[PDB]
Amino acid sequence: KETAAAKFERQHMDSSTSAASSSNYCNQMMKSRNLTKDRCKPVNTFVHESLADVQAVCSQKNVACKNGQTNCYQSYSTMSITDCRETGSSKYPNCAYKTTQANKHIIVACEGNPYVPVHFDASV
Numbered sequence: 001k002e003t004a005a006a007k008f009e010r011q012h013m014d015s016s017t018s019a020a021s022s023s024n025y026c027n028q029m030m031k032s033r034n035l036t037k038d039r040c041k042p043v044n045t046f047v048h049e050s051l052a053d054v055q056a057v058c059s060q061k062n063v064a065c066k067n068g069q070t071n072c073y074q075s076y077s078t079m080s081i082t083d084c085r086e087t088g089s090s091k092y093p094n095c096a097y098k099t100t101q102a103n104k105h106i107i108v109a110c111e112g113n114p115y116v117p118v119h120f121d122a123s124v
Helices: 004-012 025-032 051-059
Strands: 043-047 061-063 072-074 079-086 097-104 106-112 115-123
Touching: 004 043, 004 106, 004 115, 025 043, 025 079, 025 097, 051 072, 051 106, 051 115
Parallel strands: none
Antiparallel strands: 043 079, 061 072, 072 106, 079 097, 106 115
């Protein structure tokens, strides 16, 4: 298929940009990352930092995941992110998203060898 680390990268990494510049950022990215393919994914966060900086979070502050697992880590510093959330009017296959650019800590679930991010838990 796709490995768990490769899938995290495709759904959440966007280092080519420093921040979302238009309210159209989410509609374009959700589409080009093939996240509106079978349905409209309701919520998705893009991180605008290098892959190495995001991978480094697996060695930062260990916190519990929203599901109760303890393989979640919170970044010591804030990072540039973009939250994409489907609007109330969105309907497959005409997906519409609201873009919210912000700077905040990210929380990720890590695993394997090497121990890398495999799930985006929350931003705070």
